[PDB]
Amino acid sequence: NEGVENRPFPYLTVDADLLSNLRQSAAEGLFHSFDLLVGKDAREAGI
Amino acid sequence: NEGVENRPFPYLTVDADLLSNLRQSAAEGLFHSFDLLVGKDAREAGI
Amino acid sequence: KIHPGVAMTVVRTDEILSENILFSSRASTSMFIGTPNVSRREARVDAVTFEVHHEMASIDTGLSYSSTMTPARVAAITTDMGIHTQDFFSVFPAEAFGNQQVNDYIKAKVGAQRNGTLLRDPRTYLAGMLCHGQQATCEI
Amino acid sequence: DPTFTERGFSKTVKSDLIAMFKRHLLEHSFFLDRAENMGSGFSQYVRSRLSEMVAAVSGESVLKGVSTYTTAKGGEPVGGVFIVTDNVLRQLLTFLGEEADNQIMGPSSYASFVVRGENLVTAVSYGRVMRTFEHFMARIVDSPEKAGSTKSDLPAVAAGVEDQPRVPISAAVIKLGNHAVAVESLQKMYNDTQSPY
Amino acid sequence: MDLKVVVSLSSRLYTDEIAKMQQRIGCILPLASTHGTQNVQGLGLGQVYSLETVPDYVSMYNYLSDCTLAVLDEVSVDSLILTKIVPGQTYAIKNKYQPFFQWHGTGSLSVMPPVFGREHATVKLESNDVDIVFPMVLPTPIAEEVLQKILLFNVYSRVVMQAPGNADMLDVHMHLGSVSYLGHHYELALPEVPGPLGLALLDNLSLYFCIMVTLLPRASMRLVRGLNLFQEMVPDEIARIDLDDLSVADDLSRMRVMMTYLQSLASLFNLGPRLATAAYSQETLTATCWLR
Amino acid sequence: KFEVLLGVYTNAIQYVRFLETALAVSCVNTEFKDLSRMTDGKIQFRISVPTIAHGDGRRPSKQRTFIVVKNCHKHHISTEMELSMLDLEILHSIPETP
Amino acid sequence: RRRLQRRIAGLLPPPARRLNISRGSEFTRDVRGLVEEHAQASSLSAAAVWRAGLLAPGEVAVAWSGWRPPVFGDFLIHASSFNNAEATGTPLFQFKQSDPFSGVDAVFTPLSLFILMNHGLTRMANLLYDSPATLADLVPDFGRLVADRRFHNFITPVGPLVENIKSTYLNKITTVVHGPVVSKAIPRSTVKVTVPQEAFVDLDAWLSQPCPADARLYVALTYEEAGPRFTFFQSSRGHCQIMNILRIYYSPSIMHRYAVVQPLHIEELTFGAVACLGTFSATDGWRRSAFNYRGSSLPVVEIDSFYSNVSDWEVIL
Amino acid sequence: EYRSTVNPWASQLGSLGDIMYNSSYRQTAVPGLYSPCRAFFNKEELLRNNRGLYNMVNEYSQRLGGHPATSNTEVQFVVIAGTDVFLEQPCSFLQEAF
């Protein structure tokens, strides 16, 4: 849907890795609300 | 036109009265964005 | 008892009761316990209908699945895996042939209009509106 | 099982997983029905199916690092709970041995998320409350050059689930090797209320 | 603010009187006064629906719309503690009426005077010589249909006792012998022999109705000559050009008595004390209603 | 010649709390008092995916990042208990006789 | 004779209506006791109930003011037949079902009633209900029940919705059938009856001396040539006036119904019916608004401060 | 791969199986009887499961989106109330009968 916030937050460094089967899950839509930043989408956005 | 958030703010009291020709202004639309609260609805809204 | 020119297949459903397992990982969801509230709703002369309010808000803490459910053992088969063709004079009752004589004869020679009492889910019906187990509905 | 989900999904991988759905439905559907067929590798059979269950679940919660529930007798985190009926609880107690523990340490009372002053100001003005405003202000006002680590952010995720006295609740604790999962049945809670479980 | 109207009995009851009263522990009945204690002679419809005089629907309906009503709550052996209905609050009534018309939630109930026989709605008290007649309480569309069907049965019985060449007694009975509402197909108890010279219920209403529709066409002719063309195309013209000359005293007398017989009848077909339900639960046969 | 009654027996209801049952390891709870005022919740994950430098000439996926957000959903439970007005009038009154 | 004194001292005190105020800056205990009103809600604790006084008989009093609590009539409906995106204050219209023992109900908002009648207003009707066929069989024979012109005595208005829990399969709504329409939530907020602007007409605006204390909302089914319509009148008069006033207002359409078709039958002869829906303040009501859906919006008539009170159906001719 | 259909009287778009079974059920439909062919023939139900793998796996556990049958009756009806039923039909998932 890509109705995501996408503002530079103070993000919390958590221990658990969530990368397991991640891109395949986001490929077929496990979530309704998710965003795929590739390359120079991955800048922390402007205020 | 009903564009105002209508939230209970901590409002500031000013020195200068602004009360002259007010209902007359709001009758014909000197202000683009406003909200009239009459009697019962003049309560501050809920959080 | 001769064969016609066609050859049908028959579809049923067979309800199988189980006793499921439920696993979920540690701290799968994060919930907020709201404070309970009491509220009266109808106050007639003799008794006052109370009502308690409670609200919770459940949110996930992982991305992928974190809870699962498997059917452990069969308890029993709640339906009879049998022969009960559902009646097409009841699911399409507005359909009728040319004469009334031939239609009445056809409804006579087949099992037509055998249970016209319930035509909906009886849980939706109130209290107090073929004496064997649950007939699996065949279809042709 | 990630052994098929690595090259990306396609027509072929989705077809393969549909066929493996059909295979697992026709072979290993009722894992306690065909448990009682074999008797030798039988405690190991239920043990294998339950280890397969806690391996097919994804324990990657963000609250993984904080210790909320441990065993009383040893400092081992629980890592999941099993909800079954009564007969299956009795059968699994016989098959997985009576070596289960009786108690696990847990939180006594809930944590509290009371809206403090600054979050009240944001709620009053905009109606948007942020969780733990102290940590936001400590990150992007007070020295934002400090990069975040897990060891730094362990009080940030654990808001109030760590400052609770540990009191033991009663639960059967079976071990699938290195985890200590907890079986329990609430049918007791549902039977007196004349209600379907 | 208390509402207990405890009516006291002079001589205490037997056991079977209590056995009849405990099966009507939820019905309503009209009182005489709104005072804290009473005697038994002011209770429901005894003095107007007595067995010794000829009864009529009109005065029964007038008395029923007149006084306060009251659901009954407790039946002791010598006292009948009950509560009256004010329009301020809402109450819990039960459909314990012997012609059992099934109620429904959010329906509108009509407190009617009894038509289906005195013995269906009575508690024949012997220790005191009173007959507590309970009024019929039944839903308004069924009330309308049962009024139409008792009225047409009265008119059609009167015309076949007038002359047997009019109609057939099965033909009137295979239509008006049943009331239908939401598929609940009831059957009505009809007095097939009412007896001539009145002496029965629903004669005074039927006489009023038949005199009204008898005086109706010249009334319409007079009130269209008094005043247009649309009003002179809907009826047939044989009811339009009928007389044009009647004596003014008799014309005024007929118009005035037609007007009284219309206004009483039109006030009557509005069913008077009308109650409006909220949540009728027939697991316990309880309806929750208020005075509307 | 008497008819005897031997006992009236009444069950004691057990109370079952969430922090006492073993389903509370499955979810972490925080007493948020003013919950019906909160319209919606929102959790937000920024997931940066490190990738592997390969040997051959492929179309290289660059520094990827996943922003996934998840919402909360409310749950509203309510049952009806009844109380007769007689018991309430007896409650708010004051007695004097046994 | 002294026990009676202590009892009659408790049954004596009416609420103190007038009060000698001294200065408005004082805000003393007497004016607080005058302005305080007890709630229908508190948290489930001993102190909170014993201070809010929820266990008081008849009213709520901590230990007859012109104020009575409302009465709710709850209906269970097929969840497809009631678009759950509709607001709180919309007037529902329960159809009296012809099924003998059916515990399921068939309520209607007027928007859902519009697609029942015909088969912007039509755009919001078909966006709120993509399916004009699952409601065309709730009424089983709509063509017969309208073609004999007995549709008005089957529809019982049950006033506005107040709270609607969105269940999945069989939906439970809580309406208010009679009395003061107010919410039951943990933050209590005002409920306003919203009627669509194209359906709602006024009656003092159509007519263009005294001011009354309240105005009454009227609903009006009417059988036209092109099907029935559900117009919503607002009036500040009495009922027996309003029957003649709407007879005047429909005296065009009465001649139109006698003109475009000639009623050879006898059951066609009725021309709609009107039923009162309750009273509201006649001064500051029906401030208009727009009801915003996911993609579109219709203009809406937001009557605040309703006292729901349904009357029965009276024919118009 | 060596044929198109095992039968041409129910596989085609205008075939007889899609005549007497493709009628979409309404929750207010006064016959209301349960059908086992409408889980296999209902066209928009047959395209509901095209929303991705994880979407329909989520829809398997969130709601009873197929054609579920009621229980504990004389003849199986389309479940309408469903206030305390619990059923997982994978014949709505993968559309294959045994």
Side-chain angles (χ1 to χ4, degrees):
Chain A
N1 174 83
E2 281 71 31
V4 197
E5 188 139 37
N6 197 338
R7 278 204 213 91
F9 274 102
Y11 273 121
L12 295 175
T13 299
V14 80
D15 54 65
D17 60 338
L18 323 177
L19 318 154
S20 300
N21 223 336
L22 175 75
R23 195 215 58 174
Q24 281 81 240
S25 64
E28 303 182 304
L30 196 150
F31 320 100
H32 308 92
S33 73
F34 81 110
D35 179 356
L36 192 150
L37 306 171
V38 47
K40 198 25 78 149
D41 312 309
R43 49 180 309 259
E44 302 192 349
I47 308 172
Chain B
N1 66 279
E2 271 67 30
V4 196
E5 60 267 59
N6 197 10
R7 292 193 178 111
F9 285 97
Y11 273 112
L12 302 173
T13 75
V14 303
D15 65 90
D17 50 350
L18 317 173
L19 289 152
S20 317
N21 268 310
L22 275 196
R23 192 200 41 198
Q24 298 316 299
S25 60
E28 307 300 274
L30 200 150
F31 307 110
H32 301 86
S33 72
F34 78 107
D35 193 356
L36 160 67
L37 310 182
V38 47
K40 152 185 50 64
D41 305 73
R43 53 183 305 267
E44 44 92 23
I47 310 178
Chain C
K1 290 306 179 214
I2 74 174
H3 194 246
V6 306
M8 61 291 294
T9 179
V10 171
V11 183
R12 304 177 306 179
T13 69
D14 293 345
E15 287 204 27
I16 314 300
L17 163 65
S18 74
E19 281 205 297
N20 291 89
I21 319 289
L22 169 65
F23 187 58
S24 88
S25 42
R26 181 170 75 104
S28 167
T29 56
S30 165
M31 316 192 178
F32 293 130
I33 295 309
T35 302
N37 281 90
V38 51
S39 282
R40 56 195 291 164
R41 49 176 292 154
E42 293 94 23
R44 48 211 176 168
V45 283
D46 50 352
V48 286
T49 302
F50 268 54
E51 195 178 14
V52 284
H53 283 98
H54 187 249
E55 267 169 350
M56 45 173 276
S58 282
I59 204 168
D60 197 356
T61 49
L63 310 188
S64 59
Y65 283 129
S66 278
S67 84
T68 177
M69 167 218 70
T70 176
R73 45 172 299 115
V74 54
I77 299 172
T78 67
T79 180
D80 68 89
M81 301 180 180
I83 303 184
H84 177 273
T85 52
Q86 67 152 19
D87 172 271
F88 273 85
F89 293 89
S90 87
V91 290
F92 300 95
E95 311 291 332
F97 269 117
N99 280 358
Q100 201 34 70
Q101 296 179 358
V102 59
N103 183 10
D104 182 48
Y105 168 73
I106 283 158
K107 284 196 295 205
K109 278 306 185 51
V110 312
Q113 287 91 17
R114 307 315 302 269
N115 210 26
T117 293
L118 288 181
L119 302 174
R120 218 178 59 242
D121 178 33
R123 192 177 296 179
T124 79
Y125 273 103
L126 298 166
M129 169 57 201
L130 71 160
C131 205
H132 68 298
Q134 187 169 3
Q135 293 168 317
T137 58
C138 285
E139 272 185 344
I140 294 298
Chain D
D1 185 10
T3 56
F4 319 116
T5 48
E6 281 152 8
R7 281 82 54 197
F9 277 90
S10 89
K11 267 185 185 279
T12 66
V13 186
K14 283 197 297 184
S15 176
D16 190 359
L17 290 172
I18 284 298
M20 197 173 289
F21 289 158
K22 181 76 78 69
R23 166 169 324 145
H24 276 284
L25 203 64
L26 282 198
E27 271 201 358
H28 314 90
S29 83
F30 301 117
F31 86 107
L32 216 65
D33 187 14
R34 66 196 73 254
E36 294 154 345
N37 287 325
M38 84 274 291
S40 316
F42 175 54
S43 175
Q44 321 302 286
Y45 182 66
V46 174
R47 191 64 61 97
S48 175
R49 294 311 292 271
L50 261 70
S51 277
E52 181 143 22
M53 203 180 312
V54 303
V57 82
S58 76
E60 50 270 21
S61 63
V62 289
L63 279 302
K64 166 191 299 300
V66 57
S67 78
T68 71
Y69 279 95
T70 55
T71 319
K73 321 170 175 182
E76 156 177 22
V78 173
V81 289
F82 271 87
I83 314 301
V84 288
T85 68
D86 272 282
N87 320 327
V88 185
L89 161 68
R90 175 202 33 171
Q91 282 191 49
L92 259 71
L93 264 191
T94 69
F95 299 155
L96 304 175
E98 312 316 320
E99 58 95 23
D101 298 330
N102 70 87
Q103 51 193 22
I104 49 174
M105 301 316 287
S108 42
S109 168
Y110 295 93
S112 303
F113 179 45
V114 57
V115 178
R116 307 306 308 181
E118 300 92 332
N119 269 308
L120 169 65
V121 173
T122 61
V124 152
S125 300
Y126 318 130
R128 293 219 79 186
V129 188
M130 60 201 96
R131 188 148 166 85
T132 75
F133 185 82
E134 181 68 34
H135 293 88
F136 266 55
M137 187 175 170
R139 284 307 181 276
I140 60 169
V141 174
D142 194 7
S143 73
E145 307 95 5
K146 170 165 52 206
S149 68
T150 290
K151 192 176 179 180
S152 87
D153 295 12
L154 66 91
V157 179
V161 309
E162 73 276 18
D163 46 286
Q164 288 149 330
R166 287 287 175 254
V167 287
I169 82 166
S170 276
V173 187
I174 60 147
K175 274 81 175 174
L176 310 182
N178 45 2
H179 319 294
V181 313
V183 306
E184 203 79 4
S185 294
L186 288 172
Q187 208 191 15
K188 167 62 199 169
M189 191 260 289
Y190 269 72
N191 276 316
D192 45 353
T193 67
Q194 303 264 102
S195 311
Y197 200 65
Chain E
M1 186 168 314
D2 208 331
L3 306 169
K4 309 295 174 187
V5 190
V6 46
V7 49
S8 279
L9 293 151
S10 43
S11 90
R12 47 183 285 139
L13 300 159
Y14 312 133
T15 314
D16 45 351
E17 294 158 308
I18 304 175
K20 296 210 69 165
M21 286 284 283
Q22 287 275 345
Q23 285 185 355
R24 298 176 98 115
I25 210 174
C27 281
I28 72 149
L29 71 156
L31 283 166
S33 90
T34 172
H35 302 318
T37 82
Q38 287 189 357
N39 81 310
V40 202
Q41 274 78 37
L43 290 176
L45 295 173
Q47 52 265 0
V48 49
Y49 190 48
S50 88
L51 76 168
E52 56 93 14
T53 180
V54 52
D56 67 305
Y57 196 85
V58 177
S59 49
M60 285 191 314
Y61 154 73
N62 292 144
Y63 176 62
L64 188 45
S65 43
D66 182 16
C67 48
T68 172
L69 322 183
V71 67
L72 72 94
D73 164 86
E74 201 267 356
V75 182
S76 294
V77 189
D78 48 359
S79 80
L80 323 177
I81 292 191
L82 52 86
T83 44
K84 49 170 195 310
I85 43 172
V86 315
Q89 290 178 354
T90 171
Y91 292 81
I93 79 180
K94 294 159 186 45
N95 43 355
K96 312 213 161 176
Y97 298 93
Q98 265 72 14
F100 178 59
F101 294 131
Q102 171 89 345
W103 290 352
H104 278 89
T106 189
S108 84
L109 268 293
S110 151
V111 185
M112 259 182 51
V115 180
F116 316 107
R118 184 194 218 265
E119 71 279 355
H120 280 270
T122 178
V123 181
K124 174 64 65 70
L125 292 195
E126 184 43 58
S127 317
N128 306 268
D129 214 18
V130 299
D131 302 339
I132 293 184
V133 181
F134 284 105
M136 274 314 293
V137 167
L138 61 95
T140 319
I142 326 175
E144 261 280 357
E145 305 255 10
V146 78
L147 258 294
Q148 296 146 2
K149 287 167 178 188
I150 192 75
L151 187 44
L152 264 172
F153 171 61
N154 197 290
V155 173
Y156 267 114
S157 158
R158 278 302 190 258
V159 295
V160 302
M161 293 159 34
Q162 163 89 41
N166 289 330
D168 176 84
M169 209 52 208
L170 178 55
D171 304 359
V172 56
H173 208 271
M174 74 172 195
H175 294 256
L176 315 172
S178 315
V179 60
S180 305
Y181 166 75
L182 308 188
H184 309 252
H185 174 261
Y186 305 99
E187 310 273 26
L188 295 181
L190 296 173
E192 283 96 356
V193 48
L197 291 86
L199 56 82
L201 193 39
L202 264 291
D203 283 82
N204 309 75
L205 188 62
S206 90
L207 261 296
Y208 278 5
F209 184 94
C210 64
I211 289 305
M212 163 157 155
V213 82
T214 311
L215 298 180
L216 190 76
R218 282 180 194 168
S220 192
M221 199 270 304
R222 188 80 264 170
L223 291 159
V224 300
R225 291 300 182 271
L227 308 182
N228 308 310
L229 275 302
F230 155 73
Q231 284 79 357
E232 297 150 10
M233 288 191 293
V234 195
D236 44 347
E237 292 290 326
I238 71 177
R240 199 57 95 204
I241 200 64
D242 48 356
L243 179 65
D244 285 331
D245 60 337
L246 207 43
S247 76
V248 196
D250 197 4
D251 175 91
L252 173 73
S253 298
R254 282 162 47 106
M255 263 296 305
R256 200 203 296 125
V257 66
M258 191 275 323
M259 272 305 299
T260 39
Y261 285 168
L262 179 147
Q263 62 214 20
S264 42
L265 191 83
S267 59
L268 192 144
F269 282 138
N270 210 15
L271 269 305
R274 177 159 306 182
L275 263 53
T277 41
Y280 168 68
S281 70
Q282 59 266 38
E283 302 80 358
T284 169
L285 270 75
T286 301
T288 293
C289 77
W290 53 91
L291 178 46
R292 207 255 302 281
Chain F
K1 262 181 292 190
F2 38 77
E3 156 189 276
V4 63
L5 71 156
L6 307 166
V8 44
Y9 296 127
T10 304
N11 44 317
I13 308 165
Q14 56 263 3
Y15 68 101
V16 47
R17 307 189 301 130
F18 203 83
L19 284 160
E20 288 312 284
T21 177
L23 192 48
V25 190
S26 159
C27 79
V28 159
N29 306 317
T30 300
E31 190 71 26
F32 188 59
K33 298 176 186 177
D34 42 357
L35 180 54
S36 167
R37 319 194 150 278
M38 167 210 98
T39 59
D40 190 31
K42 205 176 64 50
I43 207 162
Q44 170 146 338
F45 303 105
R46 166 158 169 273
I47 293 304
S48 79
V49 182
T51 316
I52 294 187
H54 273 86
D56 76 274
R58 57 190 56 214
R59 206 205 72 82
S61 183
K62 312 181 176 63
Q63 39 170 10
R64 265 173 309 191
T65 298
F66 271 99
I67 318 294
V68 61
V69 289
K70 275 209 170 201
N71 307 313
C72 78
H73 47 82
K74 304 292 291 296
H75 286 293
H76 178 219
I77 42 178
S78 277
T79 193
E80 313 179 312
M81 55 154 171
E82 293 192 332
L83 266 174
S84 89
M85 196 82 100
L86 271 63
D87 283 292
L88 266 66
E89 297 159 84
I90 293 315
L91 176 61
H92 277 294
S93 162
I94 178 166
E96 71 282 355
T97 67
Chain G
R1 78 277 189 193
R2 294 205 71 238
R3 170 189 174 274
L4 275 80
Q5 269 191 359
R6 286 164 201 138
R7 280 283 97 173
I8 202 168
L11 291 176
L12 187 140
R17 299 175 297 182
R18 272 92 50 84
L19 173 61
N20 188 289
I21 199 66
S22 299
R23 282 303 186 106
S25 44
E26 281 153 359
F27 200 70
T28 56
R29 180 252 195 273
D30 54 336
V31 71
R32 284 199 64 198
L34 203 141
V35 304
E36 263 176 338
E37 202 64 42
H38 300 321
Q40 308 281 349
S42 43
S43 69
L44 197 48
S45 158
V49 171
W50 208 244
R51 182 152 159 103
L54 256 287
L55 311 167
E59 66 180 34
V60 193
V62 52
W64 179 217
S65 90
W67 166 249
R68 49 162 281 178
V71 56
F72 299 92
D74 309 332
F75 308 121
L76 265 69
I77 42 182
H78 305 293
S80 91
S81 157
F82 184 74
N83 192 285
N84 280 149
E86 291 158 28
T88 68
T90 170
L92 303 178
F93 291 89
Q94 183 215 69
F95 181 72
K96 266 299 163 59
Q97 290 181 354
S98 316
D99 192 286
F101 279 77
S102 158
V104 76
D105 291 318
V107 308
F108 296 115
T109 207
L111 310 172
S112 49
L113 213 49
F114 190 46
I115 56 159
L116 189 42
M117 297 306 108
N118 313 305
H119 309 77
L121 183 59
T122 316
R123 179 175 315 125
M124 191 42 71
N126 293 33
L127 191 51
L128 275 182
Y129 302 94
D130 271 307
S131 74
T134 183
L135 269 76
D137 74 320
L138 284 173
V139 50
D141 40 358
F142 185 75
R144 185 52 57 191
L145 170 63
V146 172
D148 84 290
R149 310 286 206 82
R150 276 201 221 277
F151 197 33
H152 72 89
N153 54 3
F154 275 85
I155 307 173
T156 302
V158 299
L161 168 61
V162 48
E163 321 294 349
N164 170 35
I165 49 171
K166 287 113 169 178
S167 47
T168 316
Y169 267 113
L170 204 63
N171 214 285
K172 165 172 200 191
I173 48 174
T174 67
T175 73
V176 171
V177 192
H178 188 278
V181 188
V182 75
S183 67
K184 46 180 286 187
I186 307 309
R188 192 169 126 176
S189 200
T190 73
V191 186
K192 310 179 182 63
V193 187
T194 81
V195 171
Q197 171 72 254
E198 205 268 349
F200 176 79
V201 311
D202 210 294
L203 217 58
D204 60 76
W206 178 75
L207 291 158
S208 49
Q209 290 181 358
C211 80
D214 55 7
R216 299 158 189 173
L217 177 64
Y218 286 75
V219 75
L221 160 67
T222 165
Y223 310 132
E224 301 155 354
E225 171 52 48
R229 284 195 54 198
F230 271 84
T231 82
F232 279 61
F233 295 97
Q234 152 175 3
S235 155
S236 298
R237 270 90 188 277
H239 317 269
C240 314
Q241 306 197 33
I242 286 309
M243 309 312 284
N244 309 120
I245 292 164
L246 305 182
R247 253 185 293 275
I248 290 292
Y249 173 79
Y250 277 162
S251 278
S253 45
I254 288 151
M255 308 303 175
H256 303 324
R257 192 183 60 107
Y258 192 74
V260 305
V261 287
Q262 174 72 25
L264 269 299
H265 288 171
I266 204 156
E267 74 280 343
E268 195 185 0
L269 261 50
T270 83
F271 186 73
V274 180
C276 171
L277 291 200
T279 83
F280 51 92
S281 277
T283 80
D284 51 355
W286 73 286
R287 320 165 302 109
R288 302 154 186 167
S289 162
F291 168 70
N292 201 1
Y293 199 29
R294 42 189 175 131
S296 177
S297 288
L298 82 165
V300 79
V301 181
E302 195 181 11
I303 308 176
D304 185 75
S305 309
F306 210 88
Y307 180 91
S308 80
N309 179 71
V310 187
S311 158
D312 288 284
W313 290 76
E314 323 184 270
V315 83
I316 281 298
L317 269 182
Chain H
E1 280 83 345
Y2 76 107
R3 59 166 135 83
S4 87
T5 176
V6 81
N7 67 281
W9 289 336
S11 162
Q12 311 271 331
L13 191 41
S15 45
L16 162 60
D18 284 331
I19 295 308
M20 56 170 156
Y21 299 121
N22 207 4
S23 87
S24 158
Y25 86 110
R26 287 92 54 107
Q27 277 199 6
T28 72
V30 85
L33 277 170
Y34 179 71
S35 276
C37 305
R38 295 198 297 191
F40 299 126
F41 278 68
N42 203 357
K43 177 174 60 63
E44 73 280 353
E45 207 174 51
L46 277 183
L47 311 180
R48 147 196 72 94
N49 39 1
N50 206 22
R51 293 192 201 95
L53 178 65
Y54 273 116
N55 211 1
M56 64 179 284
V57 164
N58 272 330
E59 284 170 278
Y60 191 83
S61 90
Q62 195 93 26
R63 62 172 178 246
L64 314 179
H67 268 60
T70 197
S71 175
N72 308 125
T73 73
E74 207 274 340
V75 56
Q76 285 168 311
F77 285 101
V78 165
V79 52
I80 303 184
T83 174
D84 296 273
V85 302
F86 313 95
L87 70 93
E88 277 83 4
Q89 40 163 0
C91 311
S92 62
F93 181 84
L94 48 88
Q95 305 288 140
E96 200 139 32
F98 312 98

